[model samples]
Target: MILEEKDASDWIYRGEGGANLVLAYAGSSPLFVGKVIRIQKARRLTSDEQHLWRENNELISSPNKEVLEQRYVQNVIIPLLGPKHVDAGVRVSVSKEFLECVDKKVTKQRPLARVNAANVDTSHDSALILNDHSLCISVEIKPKCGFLPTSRFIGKENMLKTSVSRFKMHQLLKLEYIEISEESEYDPLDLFSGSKERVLEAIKALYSTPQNNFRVFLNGSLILGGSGESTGRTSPEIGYAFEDALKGFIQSEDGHRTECFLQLVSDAVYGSGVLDRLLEIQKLDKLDIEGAIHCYYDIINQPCPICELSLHALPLDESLKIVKEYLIAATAKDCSIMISFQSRNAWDYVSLKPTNQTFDYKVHFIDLSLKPLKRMESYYKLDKKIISFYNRKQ
Candidate 1:
C-alpha cells in the first residue's frame, strides 16, 4: 500500500508531453501496498490552446454528448456501479457461440476504419472464464497494439525540431506526459520480454519482503481469500464485491474494496475491450515496420530495417534476439529470455493506443501467475480460478 522514494525511483522518467514525475509514497512514511497516488501538473495553454481546452472541457462537462457520456461511463458511472455489477451488466455469455457472436459483431462494427485483417479466431487464442451465479463470462485473449503515444507535433518545421518540439513545448508549459506506447512481439507471460515479467518480479519482491496482506481480483470477480485460508472458487458474493467497487468509481466515490479497485485498474490496462479497439485501427504492416524499426534501433542504436517487408521474412528467433538485446541496451541490465505467443502480447490491448493519443500506458507489477500481485490473496485466488477454468476446458 505504501511506496518509498526508492520504490519509485526506477519509474522516474523525463517523459514526453512535457511531463516529469516520480511515483512514490506521498507521506513521510513508506506508502502502503495498493495505495493509489498520482502527482501531475498540466502544461499551461496559450490563448488559442486555452480556448481549445475550455471547449473540450465544456464538451466533457456537457451531459448530452455521446463522447462525454462514454467518458462518464468509464470514469464515473462504471465505478459507482462497482466492478462486480459492471462485469455482470456487461455480460455476454462466454461460450463458443457467444464468442462467435462477439467476433461477428466486432467484424461487422469495425469500430475503427483502418484495420482490414481483423478477425476473432479462437484457434490461436485463450480464454479466462468467470462464473457469476448461473452465468459464465469468458474473456478471450488476443493480440493487439502495444504502448500509447506520449507526445505529438504538427507542422513540418515543428515535426523536424528535436530540442524544441511539441513535447518540449508541453513540458515548458508544465504538462505531465508519460510515454506508455511501445509495441512489442513479446508476451506478457514471458519473463524475458521486459513486459510482464519485470512487473511480476517487482510485485513478488515487494510482497516477499514485507508481509502485506492484500486481495486480488480479475475483471471484478474475487478469486482469493477474504474469508478463509484456501483459495475459493469464484462466487456471486465476490462478484458483487467487485461490482460495488466499480460502481464507487463510476460515482466518483471511494471504491467499496481496494482489491476490486485494483482489479478494475488492471482491467482498464489489460482487458479485452481496449484490445478490441486497437485491432480495429491497427495496420499490421505498418505496426510490423514500426516494431522492427524499434527493435533495430534499440539493439544496434541505428535503424537497420530498410522497409517493413524485410522484417516479414525474418526468423522468429532472430526477432526475439533483437528484442532481447534491445531491452538490455535500453535498461543497461541483464535478464533471462523466453519467447512464447503468451509472451509476445502480455498486457493485451489496455497498454495499446493510437499514435496520436495523449495518454500514458499504466503498468501494474503483477505476480508470476500473470495476475496483478499488488494483493497476494487476490493473486492466489485469481490464479486458482484461471487454473480451474483451464482444467475444465481441457
Candidate 2:
C-alpha cells in the first residue's frame, strides 16, 4: 500500500517519540481507519547497530529506519516479548511530498522541543501503519524500571543503586535540569509489585504526576497529559477537566470519576499480568550497566576502562549474548503500555472488581525502540551520575 500526497490531509499529528512522528488517521476511508502511521525522524542508525543486530540479516540490512524498526521488533523483540501483545504493523510506501506536508501541517501541534530537535525525514520512502489503540478510553502508562539492582557487579560507592529506584533518582536529576516542574509521585516499583492495593496506589500516584508517564485519551482525543513533552504535576484545573472528560466512560459523581477511572486502570493493569512479563524482561539486565559495560567493550574488542577483569577473556559468543540481552532489556525498560477500554458489555471484559464495572480491554506495549549499542558508555556514566546524586541527597 502507498500513502500519497492526497492521503496526507487525512492524517493528524498524534504524538512523537525520540525516533518517530506518529500521525493518527483522521479520514473516513475504511482502509486507513483505526490505524496510525509512524514516520521516521531525521536520525541515522548508530554505526554499531548493524553489528549489534548481526543475528538478523534482514534487520541489519534494512533500507531505512522504517524497515529497520519493523524487523527489529519482529526479529528481536517479538521472540522475547511474545506475539500476543505486539504488532509490527505493515509497511507502506510514502512520498516525500506526503512527509513534508505532514511536517508543515503538524508544526503548530508539535511540541517546541520536538520541533526543534527533528522533523519528518521527507527523504524516506516508507512508513509503518499500525493499529491505533486509542479508539476508546485508553491509558498509556510509561512504567520505568520496576526492580532495583541486585547485581554483585554493583560497586560499593554506588550502593544506593541497589535500593533506590532509577525512576525516582532520574526524577531528581530531571528536576535539577528543570525538565520537570516537580518530582513525580509515581514509582514503577509499586505498579510492578504485583499487589492489587499497591497497584491501585501506583495508579493514583501516576494520576497526580501524569508527566509523560501517564496519558489519558477519551475516544482518540487527549484528555490528560502533554502532547509530547513531559507535563507538570496535575493541577486542580487539569484535574477538573480530566474528571469531566471521564464523565461517560467512568460512572461516578463529580470529582469522583477520576478515582473510578484510576481504579479501572489499576484493575486492568493488575489483572492483565502485563507488567509481570515486562519486569521479567527488564530483569534481563542482570548485570547492571556497571557489569554490562565491560561486556559491551568486549563486544567491540576494546579494553575495559573500569575493571581489570576482561570480559574479553570470556568466549566471544558469550559476550555477544550478554550485550544483546542488555540492549533488549534497555528497550523493555523504556517502553510504554497502552490499555484501551470499551465500557460496554461484560461478555468479553477485564472486570474492575471494585466498581463492579466490566469493559472489554486490550493491553499493548509501544515505544519499544532499540537502544544503540554504542550508548553503552553514556549509559554507564548516567547510571553512575544518577546513583551518586541520589546517594548524596539522602
Candidate 3:
C-alpha cells in the first residue's frame, strides 16, 4: 500500500534496546501500531569498492562514532521503513538469553541480518509496545566494510595537506555508522517462517529493552548500515545523514563544490548516468510506436510540401501499422513508445464535456531516446497541427 504522511505518525518511541531503538504506536494509523524490529549497520558490497579505511586512518580514533551512526540512522534507514521522525523513548528491562536465542533463529532464517554470532546480545537490549497493535520497530547495529570513499580528497594523500589544513579533518574520515530499524505489523511468525510463538516472544523482548550495537539479519543480507569500502545504497535516513556529514567536506565559498561532490559520489555509487544502462537494456527508441503515428499525422495537414497521400484511401489498421513501424525504425534498441489519440473538438476524452465528437485526430509520439531532441519545440508544434487537422475528419 502507498503510505501517506499521516500513516507515519502512528508509531512513537516507547523504549530502546542497547544501541537499538524501539518505537510504539501513538497515532491511529493501523500500520504503525505493531511490534517492529530494526537491524542497524546492515552492509552490502558492490563492485569498484575502495579501501575507505586506508584513506582515513584517524577513523579508528574518532569520538563521534555515536554521532555519525545516529546521523546515518536518521538519513539512511528512515526512508526505507517509512517517512517519520521517531523519538527515542526511555529504557526498559530485557533478557539476554531471549535475545540471543531469537537472534540465532532470526539469523538462521534471514542470513543477511547477522554480523557475527557475538553481535546479538539480549542483556543490554530494550523494547517498546505499539499500543495494543502487533506493529513495532526494532533496530540492530553492525560493523561493515565495503563502502566507497565519500570524498575525492581522501584518495589523494598529497592534496589533503593543502585542501583544508585549517579545518577539522578528523570528522571527515570517521567511518560512518548506521542504525537499521524494521517495522512489522503482523505476527513475525506469519511474516517470517519460524516458530510463531518464539518470533512473537522475540519481538516482545526487542521492544522491551534498550539494546545497542546488535546485528539484525534479513533475507541473508544486511540492509541498514555498513562500513569499510562497499558500494550499496542505504535507507533514505542513512542517505540523508551521509549527505549531512559531507556538508563540511563539500562546503566551500564556491557553490560548485557541493555539485562536484555530489557528482563524484553519484558516479562512485551509481556508476555514471545509470539511465544509460537502463536505456541500453530497454531499447526505448526502437519501439517508437507513438512517434511514428504522430510523424505520419504531421505529414498530412502541415503546409510543408510533400507527396499528397489521400486519407480516404488509406486503411485505418494499415495507417496505424505505418506509424508503429516508423517508430520502431526511428528509435534505438532501449526505448518504448506511447501514443495518444484525441479529437480536436472534444474537451474530455470520455465525457459529454464537448458534446461534439467532430474534432480531428491529434496524434502524439513520445521520443524515448537517451539524448533529448534538439528541435523538440518545432517538432511538437508541427505534430500538434497535423494531428488536429486529421482529427476533424476521423
Candidate 4:
C-alpha cells in the first residue's frame, strides 16, 4: 500500500527545479521504501505564474488556482507523456503542525548535527507528493520537467525557456535514447526520410564522448553527476570509440564493466516524433506562435532580452516578424529530437560491441517541462539574475 503521509524525516531531498521538490523515501520501517515523492511548494502563486498556467486550457472553464497548480503534472503533463510512462503519485497534505513535529523530532535525534528549525524545506515552488523508479529497464521519464515544446511560441516564457540547460544540451547529443517501433532499428529521421547523412552528422557530434545530462543511476543509485552539460562521458576525447576513425572527419568519436552491464538509464523526453505529434494535434488553423508569446509574457513581470531590446520597444506587428524569425531557428534546434532504450542484459555493463541478437527494451521521452523563456529571455533579465547571484557568492 502507498503510505499516505509520514514524518518529514521519512523523505530526503533529492533534487528541485522552479516548480517542484523531489524526495526519496528514507524511513526504516520500509513503507514505500523504493519510491521517491515529489512535493509542490506551499506558497501563494505569483501573478506571473498564475496567468501563465491559468491563461487558458481545454477545461470547460478555469479550475481554481490550487487545482491548476496541482493538476499541471498529473493532468496536463500525464496526457502528453502517455499515462503508462507516468505515475500518479499519491496525494498527501503537509500541515504546518506536521512540520513542527518533524523539526522537533529531528532535533532530538541528532544532537551533534547543526539543526535547522524545520526538516521540511519551506522554500518550495508548488506543493505536491507521490511515488516512483528508473532504468533503461523501462524508460523512466521525468515527464513534466525539461522538454522545450518551445516554438509553438505562446509567450515569452516559451521563447526564452528555449535555451536548453547545459544538462539538456548534452541530452540531445547522446545516443543512449533508442528508437523503438516494430521496425525501429535506427535514427529518428531514418524512420522518416532517408536522412542517414544528416542523422550521422548529428550523432557524430553527440557520440564523440559520454555525457551525463539526466543523472545516471546504477541500480537506481545515482552514479555520475546528474549534470550532463558538464558530462564526463569522457572527454576531451575527440572521437567516439564506437565509430571508425575517419582521418579527416571532424566528427571524430567515442565504459563500464564487468556488470559492465549498462542497462543504463539516461533521461529527458525527446525524439522528433513527439513534437511532430503534438504539433499535428495543435493543427494549423489555431496555430499562433506570436499570440502565444504575447499571452505568455503578458503574464510575467520579467522582461525578455530579445523582446526587450528589440520586440519590447517596437510596434506589435514589427515585433511579431522578428520573434517569428527567431523561433524558426529555435524550433528546429530545440524541439523535435531522440529516443531512449532499455538494455536486456549485463552484456552491455561489460562492454560496447556489436551484438547480433535483438535486444529487448522499452523506450519513451522524458523531462517534459516547457521551455521558451529559458532561451529567448535569458540574455535579458534571467541571465543577468544568474550572473549577479553567482557573483555575489564569489
Top candidate on TM-score is: 2
Cα-lDDT of candidate 1: 0.28
Q: Which candidate number has the best lDDT?
A: 2
Q: Give the lDDT ranking, best first.
A: 2, 4, 3, 1
Compare candidates 2 and 4 on TM-score and give the better one. 2
TM accuracy, model 2:
0.92
Candidates ranked by TM-score? 2, 4, 3, 1
**C-alpha lDDT score of every prediction, in listed order:** 0.28, 0.84, 0.29, 0.37
Q: Estimated TM-score per prediction?
A: 0.19, 0.92, 0.20, 0.46
Candidate 4 lDDT over 121-189, as tens digits, reads 433222344444542322222211223334443345343334533233223323233211111112323
Q: How many Å off is the CA of 115 in candidate 2?
A: 5.2
Lowest-sum lDDT 10-residue window in model 4: 258-267
For model 3, where is the 10-residue window of minimal lDDT? 45-54
Candidate 3, 39-146: lDDT as tens digits: 222122011111212222332233433333332223322232222222222223344544554444444443333334234344333332222211111123111111
On TM-score, who's better, 2 or 3? 2
After superposing candidate 4, which stretches have Cα over 4 Å from the reference? 1-9, 26-33, 41-67, 79-81, 95-131, 135-215, 231-233, 236-367, 370-394
Cα TM-score of candidate 3: 0.20
Error of 1 at 85 (Å): 28
